Subunit: 250 residues, 2 copies
Amino acid sequence: PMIIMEKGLLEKYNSLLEFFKNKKVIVAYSGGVDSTLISKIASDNAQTLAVTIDNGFFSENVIKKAENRAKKYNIPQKTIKIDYLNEITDLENRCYNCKKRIAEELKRIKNELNYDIIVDGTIYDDIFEDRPGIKAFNESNIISPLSNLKFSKNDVFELSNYLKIDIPKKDTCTRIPISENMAKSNLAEEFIKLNFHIESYLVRLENIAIIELTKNESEKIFDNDSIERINTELKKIGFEKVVLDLNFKG
Amino acid sequence: IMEKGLLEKYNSLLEFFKNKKVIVAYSGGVDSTLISKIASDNAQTLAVTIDNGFFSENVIKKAENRAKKYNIPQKTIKIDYLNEITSKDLENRCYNCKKRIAEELKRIKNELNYDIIVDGTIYDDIFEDRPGIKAFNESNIISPLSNLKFSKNDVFELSNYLKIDIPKKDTCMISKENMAKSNLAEEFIKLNFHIESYLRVRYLENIAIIELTKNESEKIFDNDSIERINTELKKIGFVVLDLNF
Ligand SMILES: Nc1ncnc2c1ncn2[C@@H]1O[C@H](COP(=O)(O)OP(=O)(O)NP(=O)(O)O)[C@@H](O)[C@H]1O
Ligand SMILES: Nc1ncnc2c1ncn2[C@@H]1O[C@H](COP(=O)(O)OP(=O)(O)NP(=O)(O)O)[C@@H](O)[C@H]1O
């Protein structure tokens, strides 16, 4: 080994090295950190083409940055345009259908170019979240090696740094109280107070319920049952997320 | 409008727009849709969307379709801003970039011999740090929602009273210091509490949002863990746990 890194990450990296060997690899490339990492590893070790599908959901600035970032790392890259907007397909089934249309090109591109595999930049952390398009890519036989090797996001950052891939800066363009929300707050307090016998002092932003409380009550909510009930019911009041302050007051 | 406060703001807008030719800096978002619709119902109005390459086609199309839906006259003007190197600070890149939009809006106002340019900045916005607000002011672009002290709730309420739909979430939908802070928080909790499975630390406004699976959740439940995790994730300078596992 030419880099010294933790054995866990080194095994994952080595698995990637062997997997790409002697393959012609189409990489589904979005320009982000995750798909940049695997594009660079593939291109350093195999005949590789990073393919960006421009379906109208990425601005020119984002597309240009992805192209310049591939050139910077000597990753062969092409941007292929589809007019997906004019071919519409449902309620968020757009996610699956939008991603499926991206998956369907690339599979066309892989067959036209007689390449061997398509890989993407989906990581292990991603498959625990609600991302419908992961199904859509699997249905086109697009492999997620970072997910197969159980890459966390931390593993992506560390491996990127070892391979001297810069984390891209933010476009952005920082810091971000009325009362309906006083009503939601109080009813959330009243609900938990009445149901968990939370006599002691205890719900605070952007429709997110921030709960504060003391240690003695804290042992009561630890059972998942409570949390499952507390998360659904404080969302019935319309809070989109329920969250608990780990700063237990005196 | 069941509220006199909101009724007064609305009436102030109607009175100000009467008999004026109004250019609206229109992005398709809730705020500039609200003032475009009020201008458009009460005055000769043109909603202008500047396509500078930082908005996707989908966003442009949705703004155009949203204008058509509410009978707001609308035009998308494309500029090739990306080809111009004029700024190099993240606050001067914003400022100079927004200046380029403002300058295009001012060109259109003079060419069409219109009277005023208004935008959708609200009162809440001016307390946050957004560089381009300076740039629009320097082109004499007015912020009526800010001048009348619209909060975010006032916009939502007035929109509902005027039957403007609040747009749904976009399909399938961050500095280096905060990526770094988050990453160190994950590393800390994973290594210390044997969180083999999924663990992530989301950051909003320097607040640590911890995410994890049900099976791992049993590990952190004891007060001891939370006391240590709350102090140490503040050592990084951020602490709260998302109850939706
Ligand atoms: N327009 C696109 N063209 C090509 N590949 C794409 C495109 N959009 C997404 N992908 C791929 O699909 C993967 C998963 O999509 P997504 O759920 O949006 O993850 P992601 O957060 O964008 N990953 P990344 O941006 O590379 O760090 C990405 O890592 C890319 O490999
Ligand atoms: N591309 C654009 N073309 C025309 N006007 C624009 C454009 N982008 C922004 N504006 C105007 O500038 C105002 C303030 O900019 P900004 O705060 O970035 O937009 P925004 O849509 O209000 N985002 P947000 O306040 O977070 O909802 C908008 O309300 C619009 O009136």
